[PDB]
């Protein structure tokens, strides 16, 4: 019932972006935390094969030199949004000599988050986590396939996101520090993952004011793994 994008319910609308909200949970999880020291972020890869090359799987991309990203579920529509977003920030620098603000980045994606149309195409199935440092410093943003964006201070997505958000609310406060949020975040990760945490399950995404560049950790990552 409500077999389309054009037929509401006698109660609500045509839950099909709602069906995509259902289609988020099947994806793997990711956790972003906004610390005033910087926005850190991580994700679970869920590698299946030894042939499955790990760096072939992307979850965090670099939109801008201080702007990263994180996806959910379906990959290719998100890749379209990444290409579009880098184009449009490149337009903002192209016409303004400056970075598009991460909020206006998110609203800029959120315009055609719902511009689905098969006449006059289909809706999308990906929730997004955005990390940036604007003039207001660290920014952690989260949108939905319906484009109804709200800023979150530390958002967890994907599978097992419930107790990740709840246990997140157990551990999060405003006066956190960065590496504290990192090790606490991967604590929640190895709580919610099913495999043994190693260098290959996860990857990091760390934007800072002094380290706008390099929203990532390379093998230090392994050291933080063996630090827990």
């Amino acid at each position: 019932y409500d077999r389309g994008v054009n037929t509401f319910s006698p109660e609500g609308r045509l839950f099909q972006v709602e069906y995509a909200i259902e289609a988020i949970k099947l994806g793997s999880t990711a956790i972003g935390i906004q610390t005033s020291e910087g926005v850190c972020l991580a994700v679970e890869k869920r590698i299946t094969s030894p042939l499955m090359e790990p760096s072939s799987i992307e979850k965090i991309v670099e939109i801008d030199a201080h702007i990263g990203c994180a996806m959910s579920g379906l990959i290719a529509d998100a890749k379209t949004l990444i290409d579009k977003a880098r184009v449009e920030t490149q337009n903002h620098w192209f016409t303004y000599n400056e970075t598009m603000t991460v909020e206006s980045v998110t609203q800029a994606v959120s315009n055609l988050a719902l511009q689905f149309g098969e006449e006059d195409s289909r809706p999308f199935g990906v929730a997004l986590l955005f990390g940036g440092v604007d003039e207001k410093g660290p920014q952690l943003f989260h949108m939905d396939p319906s484009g109804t964006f709200v800023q979150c201070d530390a958002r967890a997505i994907g599978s097992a996101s419930e107790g990740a958000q709840s246990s997140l609310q157990e551990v999060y406060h405003k006066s956190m520090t960065l590496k504290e949020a990192i090790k606490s975040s991967l604590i929640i990760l190895k709580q919610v993952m099913e495999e043994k945490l190693n260098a290959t399950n996860i990857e990091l995404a760390t934007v800072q004011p002094g380290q706008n560049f390099h929203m990532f950790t390379k093998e230090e990552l392994e050291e933080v793994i063996k630090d827990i």
Partner: peptide, 21 residues
């Protein structure tokens, strides 16, 4: 457009950029 899009004013060189385009 910039302000009601972006909740802030332009810098002078941004005006030079957009104007030059």
């Amino acid at each position: 457009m910039y302000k009601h899009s972006n909740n802030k004013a332009m810098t002078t060189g941004a005006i030079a950029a957009m104007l030059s385009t």
